[PDB]
Amino acid sequence: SMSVKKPKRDDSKDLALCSMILTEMETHEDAWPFLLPVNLKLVPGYKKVIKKPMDFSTIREKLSSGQYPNLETFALDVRLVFDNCETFNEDDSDIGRAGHNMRKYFEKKWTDTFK
Secondary structure (H helix, E strand, O other): OOOOOOOOOOOOOHHHHHHHHHHHHHOOOOOHHHOOOOOOOOOOOHHHHOOOOOOHHHHHHHHHOOOOOOHHHHHHHHHHHHHHHHHHOOOOOHHHHHHHHHHHHHHHHHHHHHO
8 A cells, every 4th residue: 555565576577578478479380370460351250259359460569569568468468369269260170279279388388487
């Protein structure tokens, strides 16, 4: 509360560490459905159904330009990518299975790096 502060968790490396995780996600062989925004003109239904589209390229631009206030807002965008994928793709499709694999990959890196 006023003038009473919990000890300072060192966040000085968070930017560099999120960037490393994002590089590893970008270079995974199952990253291909997630590298660019879904094309809203060519994919019927996507625009109306998926209220907040997200992809790896958009996260990388946000991260390079100071648009994440902290490491948690970065993790929320990564999870948004896989939540959108589960919303629109069958589990037993190539893109559905890719999304489950990538989510697993991300959450292990997240816990190993920060928890």
